[PDB]
PDB file of C-alpha atoms and ligand atoms in Angstrom:
ATOM      1  CA  UNK F   1    -163.981 199.806  16.748  1.00  0.00           C
ATOM      2  CA  UNK F   2    -161.167 198.812  14.937  1.00  0.00           C
ATOM      3  CA  UNK F   3    -157.297 199.663  15.928  1.00  0.00           C
ATOM      4  CA  UNK F   4    -155.819 200.441  13.124  1.00  0.00           C
ATOM      5  CA  UNK F   5    -158.913 203.212  13.056  1.00  0.00           C
ATOM      6  CA  UNK F   6    -158.935 204.937  16.606  1.00  0.00           C
ATOM      7  CA  UNK F   7    -155.207 204.784  16.506  1.00  0.00           C
ATOM      8  CA  UNK F   8    -155.164 207.051  13.154  1.00  0.00           C
ATOM      9  CA  UNK F   9    -158.257 209.030  14.572  1.00  0.00           C
ATOM     10  CA  UNK F  10    -156.623 209.551  18.398  1.00  0.00           C
ATOM     11  CA  UNK F  11    -153.612 210.801  15.909  1.00  0.00           C
ATOM     12  CA  UNK F  12    -156.106 212.852  13.570  1.00  0.00           C
ATOM     13  CA  UNK F  13    -157.842 214.731  16.375  1.00  0.00           C
ATOM     14  CA  UNK F  14    -154.467 215.485  18.167  1.00  0.00           C
ATOM     15  CA  UNK F  15    -152.258 216.208  15.154  1.00  0.00           C
ATOM     16  CA  UNK F  16    -152.149 220.201  15.230  1.00  0.00           C
ATOM     17  CA  UNK F  17    -149.789 220.938  12.041  1.00  0.00           C
ATOM     18  CA  UNK F  18    -149.574 219.991   8.416  1.00  0.00           C
ATOM     19  CA  UNK F  19    -146.274 218.999   9.050  1.00  0.00           C
ATOM     20  CA  UNK F  20    -146.497 216.491  10.823  1.00  0.00           C
ATOM     21  CA  UNK F  21    -150.314 215.033   9.430  1.00  0.00           C
ATOM     22  CA  UNK F  22    -147.917 214.603   6.693  1.00  0.00           C
ATOM     23  CA  UNK F  23    -146.928 211.569   8.319  1.00  0.00           C
ATOM     24  CA  UNK F  24    -150.667 210.620   8.925  1.00  0.00           C
ATOM     25  CA  UNK F  25    -151.517 210.688   5.704  1.00  0.00           C
ATOM     26  CA  UNK F  26    -148.268 208.760   4.620  1.00  0.00           C
ATOM     27  CA  UNK F  27    -149.396 206.066   7.181  1.00  0.00           C
ATOM     28  CA  UNK F  28    -153.460 205.953   5.869  1.00  0.00           C
ATOM     29  CA  UNK F  29    -151.542 205.328   2.635  1.00  0.00           C
ATOM     30  CA  UNK F  30    -149.573 202.134   3.506  1.00  0.00           C
ATOM     31  CA  UNK F  31    -152.309 200.774   6.133  1.00  0.00           C
ATOM     32  CA  UNK F  32    -155.016 201.301   2.847  1.00  0.00           C
ATOM     33  CA  UNK F  33    -152.251 199.185   0.787  1.00  0.00           C
ATOM     34  CA  UNK F  34    -151.764 196.748   3.479  1.00  0.00           C
ATOM     35  CA  UNK F  35    -155.111 195.619   3.577  1.00  0.00           C
ATOM     36  CA  UNK F  36    -155.032 195.725  -0.601  1.00  0.00           C
ATOM     37  CA  UNK F  37    -152.363 192.771  -0.095  1.00  0.00           C
ATOM     38  CA  UNK F  38    -154.070 190.561   3.057  1.00  0.00           C
ATOM     39  CA  UNK F  39    -156.987 190.603   1.062  1.00  0.00           C
ATOM     40  CA  UNK F  40    -155.811 189.595  -2.425  1.00  0.00           C
ATOM     41  CA  UNK F  41    -153.464 187.247  -1.246  1.00  0.00           C
ATOM     42  CA  UNK F  42    -156.005 185.274   0.470  1.00  0.00           C
ATOM     43  CA  UNK F  43    -158.035 185.815  -2.488  1.00  0.00           C
ATOM     44  CA  UNK F  44    -155.391 184.570  -4.379  1.00  0.00           C
ATOM     45  CA  UNK F  45    -154.408 181.415  -1.507  1.00  0.00           C
ATOM     46  CA  UNK F  46    -151.191 182.514  -1.639  1.00  0.00           C
ATOM     47  CA  UNK F  47    -148.913 183.454   1.103  1.00  0.00           C
ATOM     48  CA  UNK F  48    -148.573 186.484   2.982  1.00  0.00           C
ATOM     49  CA  UNK F  49    -146.188 188.880   3.637  1.00  0.00           C
ATOM     50  CA  UNK F  50    -145.255 192.438   3.475  1.00  0.00           C
ATOM     51  CA  UNK F  51    -141.121 194.317   2.739  1.00  0.00           C
ATOM     52  CA  UNK F  52    -139.484 191.502   2.412  1.00  0.00           C
ATOM     53  CA  UNK F  53    -136.249 191.870   1.556  1.00  0.00           C
ATOM     54  CA  UNK F  54    -134.564 190.790  -2.105  1.00  0.00           C
ATOM     55  CA  UNK F  55    -131.995 188.886   0.383  1.00  0.00           C
ATOM     56  CA  UNK F  56    -134.151 186.786   1.214  1.00  0.00           C
ATOM     57  CA  UNK F  57    -136.892 186.115  -1.408  1.00  0.00           C
ATOM     58  CA  UNK F  58    -133.241 184.758  -2.758  1.00  0.00           C
ATOM     59  CA  UNK F  59    -132.609 182.580   0.032  1.00  0.00           C
ATOM     60  CA  UNK F  60    -135.396 181.566  -0.383  1.00  0.00           C
ATOM     61  CA  UNK F  61    -135.728 180.070  -3.552  1.00  0.00           C
ATOM     62  CA  UNK F  62    -132.064 179.414  -4.213  1.00  0.00           C
ATOM     63  CA  UNK F  63    -130.548 178.680  -0.308  1.00  0.00           C
ATOM     64  CA  UNK F  64    -127.120 176.959  -2.355  1.00  0.00           C
ATOM     65  CA  UNK F  65    -126.617 181.085  -3.679  1.00  0.00           C
ATOM     66  CA  UNK F  66    -122.954 181.504  -2.989  1.00  0.00           C
ATOM     67  CA  UNK F  67    -124.287 184.957  -1.881  1.00  0.00           C
ATOM     68  CA  UNK F  68    -121.016 186.661  -0.621  1.00  0.00           C
ATOM     69  CA  UNK F  69    -120.549 186.991  -4.507  1.00  0.00           C
ATOM     70  CA  UNK F  70    -123.620 189.009  -5.666  1.00  0.00           C
ATOM     71  CA  UNK F  71    -123.890 193.212  -5.285  1.00  0.00           C
ATOM     72  CA  UNK F  72    -127.507 192.814  -3.999  1.00  0.00           C
ATOM     73  CA  UNK F  73    -129.126 196.239  -3.557  1.00  0.00           C
ATOM     74  CA  UNK F  74    -131.338 196.440  -0.247  1.00  0.00           C
ATOM     75  CA  UNK F  75    -135.492 195.874  -1.653  1.00  0.00           C
ATOM     76  CA  UNK F  76    -138.067 195.512   0.145  1.00  0.00           C
ATOM     77  CA  UNK F  77    -140.597 194.443  -2.172  1.00  0.00           C
ATOM     78  CA  UNK F  78    -143.636 193.124  -0.942  1.00  0.00           C
ATOM     79  CA  UNK F  79    -144.246 189.865  -1.225  1.00  0.00           C
ATOM     80  CA  UNK F  80    -143.430 186.951  -4.086  1.00  0.00           C
ATOM     81  CA  UNK F  81    -144.275 183.708  -5.780  1.00  0.00           C
ATOM     82  CA  UNK F  82    -141.327 180.811  -6.554  1.00  0.00           C
ATOM     83  CA  UNK F  83    -143.913 178.415  -9.066  1.00  0.00           C
ATOM     84  CA  UNK F  84    -139.841 176.006  -9.407  1.00  0.00           C
ATOM     85  CA  UNK F  85    -138.909 178.031 -12.118  1.00  0.00           C
ATOM     86  CA  UNK F  86    -140.500 181.358 -11.597  1.00  0.00           C
ATOM     87  CA  UNK F  87    -140.053 184.794  -9.678  1.00  0.00           C
ATOM     88  CA  UNK F  88    -143.055 186.408  -9.418  1.00  0.00           C
ATOM     89  CA  UNK F  89    -141.395 189.099  -7.493  1.00  0.00           C
ATOM     90  CA  UNK F  90    -145.428 191.067  -6.637  1.00  0.00           C
ATOM     91  CA  UNK F  91    -145.693 194.283  -4.765  1.00  0.00           C
ATOM     92  CA  UNK F  92    -149.342 196.220  -3.661  1.00  0.00           C
ATOM     93  CA  UNK F  93    -150.612 199.463  -4.781  1.00  0.00           C
ATOM     94  CA  UNK F  94    -153.770 201.157  -4.167  1.00  0.00           C
ATOM     95  CA  UNK F  95    -154.497 204.209  -6.645  1.00  0.00           C
ATOM     96  CA  UNK F  96    -156.633 206.050  -9.153  1.00  0.00           C
ATOM     97  CA  UNK F  97    -153.464 206.727 -11.161  1.00  0.00           C
ATOM     98  CA  UNK F  98    -150.679 204.823 -12.643  1.00  0.00           C
ATOM     99  CA  UNK F  99    -148.282 206.947 -11.530  1.00  0.00           C
ATOM    100  CA  UNK F 100    -146.656 205.541  -8.291  1.00  0.00           C
ATOM    101  CA  UNK F 101    -147.166 202.317 -10.122  1.00  0.00           C
ATOM    102  CA  UNK F 102    -144.992 203.225 -12.808  1.00  0.00           C
ATOM    103  CA  UNK F 103    -142.267 204.869 -10.598  1.00  0.00           C
ATOM    104  CA  UNK F 104    -142.286 200.861  -8.939  1.00  0.00           C
ATOM    105  CA  UNK F 105    -141.769 199.587 -10.981  1.00  0.00           C
ATOM    106  CA  UNK F 106    -139.368 201.562 -12.690  1.00  0.00           C
ATOM    107  CA  UNK F 107    -136.707 201.220  -9.511  1.00  0.00           C
ATOM    108  CA  UNK F 108    -137.967 197.248  -8.932  1.00  0.00           C
ATOM    109  CA  UNK F 109    -136.835 196.740 -12.578  1.00  0.00           C
ATOM    110  CA  UNK F 110    -133.091 198.017 -12.222  1.00  0.00           C
ATOM    111  CA  UNK F 111    -132.758 197.314  -8.862  1.00  0.00           C
ATOM    112  CA  UNK F 112    -134.036 193.113  -8.529  1.00  0.00           C
ATOM    113  CA  UNK F 113    -133.153 191.875 -12.605  1.00  0.00           C
ATOM    114  CA  UNK F 114    -129.242 193.099 -13.054  1.00  0.00           C
ATOM    115  CA  UNK F 115    -128.716 190.548 -10.051  1.00  0.00           C
ATOM    116  CA  UNK F 116    -131.211 187.941 -10.768  1.00  0.00           C
ATOM    117  CA  UNK F 117    -129.889 187.778 -13.992  1.00  0.00           C
ATOM    118  CA  UNK F 118    -126.409 187.006 -12.420  1.00  0.00           C
ATOM    119  CA  UNK F 119    -127.492 184.228 -10.210  1.00  0.00           C
ATOM    120  CA  UNK F 120    -129.623 183.102 -12.810  1.00  0.00           C
ATOM    121  CA  UNK F 121    -133.118 183.070 -11.503  1.00  0.00           C
ATOM    122  CA  UNK F 122    -136.127 183.355 -14.013  1.00  0.00           C
ATOM    123  CA  UNK F 123    -137.902 187.282 -12.399  1.00  0.00           C
ATOM    124  CA  UNK F 124    -140.169 188.792 -13.260  1.00  0.00           C
ATOM    125  CA  UNK F 125    -141.733 192.663 -10.887  1.00  0.00           C
ATOM    126  CA  UNK F 126    -145.863 192.478 -10.523  1.00  0.00           C
ATOM    127  CA  UNK F 127    -147.490 194.719  -9.198  1.00  0.00           C
ATOM    128  CA  UNK F 128    -151.230 194.804  -8.723  1.00  0.00           C
ATOM    129  CA  UNK F 129    -153.618 197.977  -7.796  1.00  0.00           C
ATOM    130  CA  UNK F 130    -156.903 198.042  -6.805  1.00  0.00           C
ATOM    131  CA  UNK F 131    -158.659 201.435  -7.813  1.00  0.00           C
ATOM    132  CA  UNK F 132    -160.424 202.213  -3.940  1.00  0.00           C
ATOM    133  CA  UNK F 133    -162.540 204.626  -5.703  1.00  0.00           C
ATOM    134  CA  UNK F 134    -164.741 201.902  -8.481  1.00  0.00           C
ATOM    135  CA  UNK F 135    -162.558 198.960  -6.925  1.00  0.00           C
ATOM    136  CA  UNK F 136    -161.453 197.688 -10.485  1.00  0.00           C
ATOM    137  CA  UNK F 137    -157.568 195.528  -9.804  1.00  0.00           C
ATOM    138  CA  UNK F 138    -155.236 196.721 -13.106  1.00  0.00           C
ATOM    139  CA  UNK F 139    -152.025 194.213 -12.943  1.00  0.00           C
ATOM    140  CA  UNK F 140    -148.243 194.327 -14.594  1.00  0.00           C
ATOM    141  CA  UNK F 141    -146.497 191.971 -14.717  1.00  0.00           C
ATOM    142  CA  UNK F 142    -147.244 189.133 -18.104  1.00  0.00           C
ATOM    143  CA  UNK F 143    -146.286 185.434 -15.447  1.00  0.00           C
ATOM    144  CA  UNK F 144    -148.581 186.960 -12.942  1.00  0.00           C
ATOM    145  CA  UNK F 145    -152.084 187.334 -15.376  1.00  0.00           C
ATOM    146  CA  UNK F 146    -151.732 184.026 -16.609  1.00  0.00           C
ATOM    147  CA  UNK F 147    -151.454 182.161 -13.485  1.00  0.00           C
ATOM    148  CA  UNK F 148    -154.232 183.829 -11.840  1.00  0.00           C
ATOM    149  CA  UNK F 149    -156.791 185.943 -14.518  1.00  0.00           C
ATOM    150  CA  UNK F 150    -160.001 186.277 -12.184  1.00  0.00           C
ATOM    151  CA  UNK F 151    -158.504 188.128  -9.324  1.00  0.00           C
ATOM    152  CA  UNK F 152    -161.974 187.096  -6.590  1.00  0.00           C
ATOM    153  CA  UNK F 153    -161.111 190.008  -4.504  1.00  0.00           C
ATOM    154  CA  UNK F 154    -163.623 191.421  -1.556  1.00  0.00           C
ATOM    155  CA  UNK F 155    -162.556 195.226  -0.909  1.00  0.00           C
ATOM    156  CA  UNK F 156    -164.176 198.080   1.060  1.00  0.00           C
ATOM    157  CA  UNK F 157    -161.665 201.503   1.047  1.00  0.00           C
ATOM    158  CA  UNK F 158    -164.456 203.171   2.968  1.00  0.00           C
ATOM    159  CA  UNK F 159    -163.263 203.287   6.137  1.00  0.00           C
ATOM    160  CA  UNK F 160    -159.518 204.517   5.037  1.00  0.00           C
ATOM    161  CA  UNK F 161    -161.340 207.421   2.850  1.00  0.00           C
ATOM    162  CA  UNK F 162    -163.725 209.236   5.928  1.00  0.00           C
ATOM    163  CA  UNK F 163    -160.021 208.709   7.355  1.00  0.00           C
ATOM    164  CA  UNK F 164    -157.405 210.565   5.428  1.00  0.00           C
ATOM    165  CA  UNK F 165    -160.482 212.623   4.539  1.00  0.00           C
ATOM    166  CA  UNK F 166    -160.935 214.540   8.772  1.00  0.00           C
ATOM    167  CA  UNK F 167    -157.336 214.848   8.089  1.00  0.00           C
ATOM    168  CA  UNK F 168    -158.273 216.974   4.551  1.00  0.00           C
ATOM    169  CA  UNK F 169    -161.235 218.853   6.560  1.00  0.00           C
ATOM    170  CA  UNK F 170    -158.868 219.194   9.085  1.00  0.00           C
ATOM    171  CA  UNK F 171    -156.457 221.876   6.843  1.00  0.00           C
ATOM    172  CA  UNK F 172    -158.715 222.661   4.591  1.00  0.00           C
ATOM    173  CA  UNK F 173    -156.907 225.776   4.366  1.00  0.00           C
TER     174      UNK F 173
HETATM  175 MN1   MN O 201    -144.738 198.270   0.409  1.00  0.00          MN
END
């Protein structure tokens, strides 16, 4: 009774090979992390965004920038927050471990902060992560942790689990 559930469902019923089911699994993963994002933004009263290009953020905080003199990498973090002195580069994980978080922390560290350091914008990269089994939230970014001590999120990942479970049940061999 939700488009996302029924569109994944139809796709799980139809899928016939493991090479194609892996793309469905990747699709659910990103869908689970989008819903985390929406709820997190609603819970935090910041505007919702997903996969925004670096160039667009730069030009929303800093419209006068002489862009073409900078090598601005093509990265798309999920969202950002501009305070007037600090640029919070946001990112949504949902996971039960921290490995993927560390990957995206390193990539976004070396790919974003160099150019922001030349433009002169105080940047910090923030990965918020929800454990989907236990619902605990883990935050990286001391400035984000400060600006938001209470994260009042109401999550439920059950539809995502049922989906990724049916996919595993179909290919348990
Ligand atoms: Mn993303």
